[PDB]
Design a protein around this ligand. Structure first.
Ligand SMILES: NC(=O)c1ccc[n+]([C@@H]2O[C@H](COP(=O)([O-])OP(=O)(O)OC[C@H]3O[C@@H](n4cnc5c(N)ncnc54)[C@H](O)[C@@H]3O)[C@@H](O)[C@H]2O)c1
Ligand SMILES: NC(=O)c1ccc[n+]([C@@H]2O[C@H](COP(=O)([O-])OP(=O)(O)OC[C@H]3O[C@@H](n4cnc5c(N)ncnc54)[C@H](O)[C@@H]3O)[C@@H](O)[C@H]2O)c1
Ligand SMILES: [Cl-]
Ligand SMILES: [Cl-]
Ligand SMILES: [Mg+2]
Ligand SMILES: [Mg+2]
Ligand SMILES: [Mg+2]
Ligand SMILES: [Mg+2]
Ligand SMILES: [Mg+2]
Ligand SMILES: [Mg+2]
Ligand SMILES: [Mg+2]
Ligand SMILES: [Mg+2]
Ligand SMILES: [Mg+2]
Ligand SMILES: [Mg+2]
Ligand code: NA
Ligand code: NA
Ligand code: NA
Ligand code: NA
Ligand code: NA
Ligand code: NA
Lengths: 308, 308
């Protein structure tokens, strides 16, 4: 096909300033322009956006600036003949680092020390509290971009790494790969269980009371996927009961996390506001995907990360 | 003529429960006995201690359970004929992990999110705040056990690593090493400056107003060495002025850090209570060194980590 301009929907501001992205693409080979929420599109238009608007169905191509596309109506794009791509592939370093940071925070007790800092308290941990990630086990559920970003960093810190993916096939830096059939075996002996799957009707509610029972009482859950992969109320009950020790949570069933959620108040819960992938260079990272697909369009090659 | 007993001074409790350590020393071939602060010593005694007591100068050998021995009067041990060893070599994984945790905390803004957690605030970072360690520069000052623990993990996370040591000679995972006379060159372009030297006459007050001026305004100091390597009042002044952005501090010129230190109150300072090396297995890690040196002394070999 033939792209005549890239419209940058104002919604991209949920992850990056639109002007930074626009200017980053000054040499793309088609003009790039800010688009407000009430604009119309037509033949030749590509649109980069955070979320979906029905107006985009008059464009030739929509690039979702997120990895997760579970809030796009994929069926309506098919019918309109509008291509849809996502941003999978670009979040491995940011998420991987964040998750390494969560794990090190728990091992080295940094969050407890931060709490004490507010009170000007020189508070020493219990002797049994501080440990090293070296030699501890992590299970990574989902072994795509996010999961591999986590795996690589965990392995380099000397962790024992296992994980779960649909094929069960070997993955670089993972000692043992399990199919989803064997989730309970995969999580049972892990100090950390990390969720890195898309939200689909197959992964929704995957981690609930029975999984928390299976998990070690000294283990922590990490959710950087989507909130509804966990049954949130079961997680609260598990934390209350001591079925698991704690959790690092970047995503929730309702975001922003409501103020009356019990999750805020657990010492060994870390709440982060859907920012495990945040980066001051997100504009460059998304721009690279746009450049790639503009080359594919020019040459008549299949688009990267095409959803429909 | 042999070591006939190992006394465990009560001061070891500053780091680990004494009876955990005593029980870890059950293999040794000499009895292991708790010693209170009024114990007398004599020929054939070895003593494991946190700090110095003049009573130890009647013993044959003191093992300091810390890496840093700056609080010991090394001069008087020589005249008394008492050997003195330290615990250098066992803190690379713990401190390396803690420092990686500090740097990831700053990059990923985890400390800011923890502050917000207390307020149930879903506070989003400014676009420029979150970054990745990958591609950022760290300068590690001191390239022994602690500094190489730091370096190896920084390198594995994709950082650019430079550093300083007395000889200025190469070190694995350090792309450029500088002599101490080139400290300002080493630190000038670093996003993180990590201190990992002993406290000596040479290093006391190494990092002061001129060093904070040279450092990038966006840089963070990490001190896991000893407080007095920094001129603490100059660090406060630099943070007030914005000469640097912040700091992760495990050690202080007075410990416990007084409740009225200005350092508690900076958002981008992390205070930790001299616990970057804390570990639930410290008793095992130190016992290994004791076993090693009991065997060295028994056989007439040079002692490991002999100071005097
Ligand atoms: N928190 C954040 O800011 C953030 C950032 C990016 C992505 N995400 C979320 O993470 C998801 C994954 O992103 P990605 O870029 O790694 O995608 P990806 O397509 O590269 O990887 C997905 C992986 O999940 C696996 N998977 C699917 N169903 C599974 C199941 N039932 N059990 C186990 N594994 C299963 C796949 O087989 C693959 O290994 C996104 O869909 C999005 O929801 C969150
Ligand atoms: N925070 C903690 O809990 C904790 C734990 C262990 C050690 N420490 C401190 O860290 C210090 C270092 O321990 P280590 O085991 O790494 O010691 P080490 O002897 O293995 O290494 C010391 C390093 O510092 C370097 N150094 C000395 N003078 C220097 C100078 N003027 N400029 C630059 N580099 C210089 C040496 O060349 C060497 O590379 C200890 O003496 C102790 O004070 C703190
Ligand atoms: Cl797969
Ligand atoms: Cl040296
Ligand atoms: Mg508006
Ligand atoms: Mg506690
Ligand atoms: Mg189940
Ligand atoms: Mg608990
Ligand atoms: Mg609360
Ligand atoms: Mg702020
Ligand atoms: Mg100077
Ligand atoms: Mg500033
Ligand atoms: Mg205060
Ligand atoms: Mg020998
Ligand atoms: Na991917
Ligand atoms: Na460990
Ligand atoms: Na459990
Ligand atoms: Na050493
Ligand atoms: Na970076
Ligand atoms: Na400066």
């Amino acid at each position: 096909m033939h792209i005549e301009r890239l419209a940058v929907d104002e919604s991209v501001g949920r992850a990056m300033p639109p002007q930074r992205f626009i200017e980053a693409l000054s040499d793309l080979g088609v003009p790039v322009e800010f688009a407000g929420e009430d604009e119309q599109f037509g033949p030749g238009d590509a649109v980069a956006s955070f979320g979906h608007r029905d107006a985009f169905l008059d464009a030739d191509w929509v690039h979702c600036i997120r990895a997760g596309y579970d809030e796009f109506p994929v069926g309506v794009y098919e019918e309109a003949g509008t291509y849809l791509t996502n941003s999978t592939g670009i979040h491995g370093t940011t998420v991987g680092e964040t998750v390494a940071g969560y794990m090190l925070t728990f091992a080295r007790r940094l969050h407890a020390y931060r709490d004490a800092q507010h009170d000007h308290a020189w508070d020493l941990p219990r002797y049994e509290e501080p440990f090293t990630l070296a030699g501890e086990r992590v299970c990574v559920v989902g072994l795509g971009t996010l999961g591999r970003g986590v795996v690589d960093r965990a392995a380099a810190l000397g962790m024992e790494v296992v994980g779960v993916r649909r094929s069960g096939d070997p993955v670089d830096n993972v000692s043992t790969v399990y199919t989803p059939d064997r989730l309970h075996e995969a999580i049972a002996d892990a100090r950390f269980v990390v969720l890195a799957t898309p939200l689909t009707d197959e992964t929704e509610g995957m981690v609930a009371a029975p999984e928390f029972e299976t998990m070690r009482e000294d283990a922590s859950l990490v959710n950087v996927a989507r909130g509804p992969v966990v049954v949130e109320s079961d997680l609260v009950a598990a934390l209350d009961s001591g079925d698991i020790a704690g959790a690092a949570l970047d995503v929730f069933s309702e975001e922003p996390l409501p103020e009356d959620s019990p999750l805020w108040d657990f010492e060994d819960v870390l709440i982060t506001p859907h920012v495990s992938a945040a980066t001051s260079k997100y504009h460059e990272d998304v721009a690279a995907l746009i450049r790639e697909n503009i080359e594919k369009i020019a040459t008549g090659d299949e688009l990267t990360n095409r959803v429909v």
